[PDB]
Design an enzyme around this catalytic site. Structure first.
Site, PDB file in Angstrom:
ATOM      1  CB  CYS A 121      -1.162   0.088   1.418  1.00 22.67           C
ATOM      2  SG  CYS A 121      -2.212   1.233   1.248  1.00 22.67           S
ATOM      3  CB  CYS A 158      -1.661   4.569   4.684  1.00 23.59           C
ATOM      4  SG  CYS A 158      -2.746   3.605   3.180  1.00 23.59           S
TER       5      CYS A 158
HETATM    6 FE   LIG Z   1      -2.793   1.648   3.705  1.00 20.67          FE
END
Ligand SMILES: [Fe+3]
Lengths: 197, 212
Positions: free
Chosen positions: A101, A104
């Site tokens: 990701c 984040c």
């Molecule tokens: Fe994330």
């Protein structure tokens, strides 16, 4: 001067946030304790390992997992927060899949466990999208030169797991025996399942 | 938001701090670390005070140097606290009084967000799409490495979700859209300066347009 704000110890700030909300009756009895138990005990890569071992031994389930991951996971009762829409991505003799990701930390919590510090690191978030071969190499996984790498950036609600290739030397193993070699890192895609000597 | 959080493709970072299958230790490395997620869920599920998208955005709103020096779980302590103050549930005074010291928060939003677009296209597997060449100052789930780039549809989700650029600001006009797994060749994203094969980005319908 590129200065940073002076701050109270993080533990004091975190507990201050708890106390401010709890003192106003906004936190049900046993609420954060319940979540801690879920995060520590229920959300686990042992669940994803179970799904992989089933797929490896059951062609019908494998097909379901790769076509409707959500349904396959639901059969085990493993849908949950940050794991409601599931896609399993299949490694092949010519393809290695890897999950990140970049924005984040988005991760299929219920079946992979909460993300590790390294996965949430700026190093991984910045680099794996651009240089996955070098990143995996540095982490101890040499991907053959004749194998493509595909990185899935978890930017919306799809929550991913890798279905790694089944290593030779595991023929006829039980689901329990197979589960043992499917580690958290295999599910994220940075490791290949290892067979002992 | 073109913030420092949009890290994919940034150069200069060192080694990922992990060797495969190395012991990562316990889920939580300190006794407070379960609090940000659990209090986030209290806010989302029990209070209905904010969305998960607002949590992502408030973390994006940390002052950039503050973001860069703050460990992961602490960013969420700061973010959840900020939302509680912005929503009028808590005050900064009481947070600092209880903390016994400074508790700086994320910066105010500089954008009111934007609604889910009315005009979008239903794309099919195998179709070539381009990521809309648009700049959004508020929350968006499009990493800049793919803005204006062309890829192929590998999946259209069978479910739909609110448009992040709206719900991330707590707006009432987020509608619902499916997302698309868009496969890009590594060279489309980073030219010669990549060692990868392809990258698949999970992109909301409203971020896409037909290619050419
Ligand atoms: Fe994330």
């Amino acid at each position: 001067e590129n200065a940073a704000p002076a701050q109270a110890p993080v533990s004091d700030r975190a507990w201050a946030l708890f106390r401010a909300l709890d003192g106003k009756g906004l936190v049900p009895d046993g609420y954060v304790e319940g979540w801690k138990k879920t995060f520590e005990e229920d959300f686990s890569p042992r669940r994803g390992a179970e799904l992989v071992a089933r797929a490896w031994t059951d062609p019908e389930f494998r097909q379901l997992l790769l076509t409707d991951g959500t349904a396959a996971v639901a059969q085990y009762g493993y849908l949950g927060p940050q794991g409601e829409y599931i896609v399993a991505v299949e490694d092949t003799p010519t393809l290695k899949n890897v999950i990140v990701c970049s924005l984040c930390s988005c991760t299929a919590w219920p079946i992979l466990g909460l993300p590790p510090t390294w996965y949430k690191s700026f190093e991984y978030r910045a680099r794996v999208v651009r240089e996955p071969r070098k990143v995996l190499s540095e982490m101890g996984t040499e991907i053959a030169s004749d194998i493509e790498i595909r990185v899935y950036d978890t930017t919306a609600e799809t929550r991913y797991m890798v279905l790694p290739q089944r290593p030779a030397g595991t023929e006829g193993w039980s689901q329990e025996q197979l589960q043992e070699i499917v580690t958290k890192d295999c599910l994220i895609g940075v490791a290949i399942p290892q067979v002992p000597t | 938001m073109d913030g420092v959080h949009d890290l994919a493709g940034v150069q200069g970072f060192g080694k990922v701090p992990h060797t495969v299958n190395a012991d990562i230790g316990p889920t939580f490395h300190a006794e407070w670390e379960h609090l940000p997620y659990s209090l986030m869920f209290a806010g989302v599920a029990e209070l209905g005070a904010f969305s998960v998208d607002e949590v992502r955005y408030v973390v994006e709103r940390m002052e950039p140097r503050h973001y860069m020096m703050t460990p992961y779980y602490e960013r969420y302590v700061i973010g959840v606290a900020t939302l509680m103050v912005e929503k009028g549930i808590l005050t900064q005074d009481e947070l600092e009084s209880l903390a016994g010291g400074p508790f700086p928060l994320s910066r105010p939003s500089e954008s009111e967000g934007r609604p889910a677009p009315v005009e979008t296209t239903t794309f099919e597997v195998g179709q070539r799409v381009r990521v809309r060449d648009e700049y959004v100052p508020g929350h968006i789930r499009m990493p800049a490495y793919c803005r204006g780039r062309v890829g192929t549809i590998s999946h259209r989700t069978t479910e739909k979700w609110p448009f992040p650029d709206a719900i991330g600001h707590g707006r009432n006009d987020a509608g619902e859209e499916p997302t698309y797994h868009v496969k890009f060749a590594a060279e489309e994203l980073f030219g010669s300066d990549t060692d990868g094969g392809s990258v698949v980005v999970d992109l909301f319908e409203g971020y896409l347009e037909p290619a050419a």
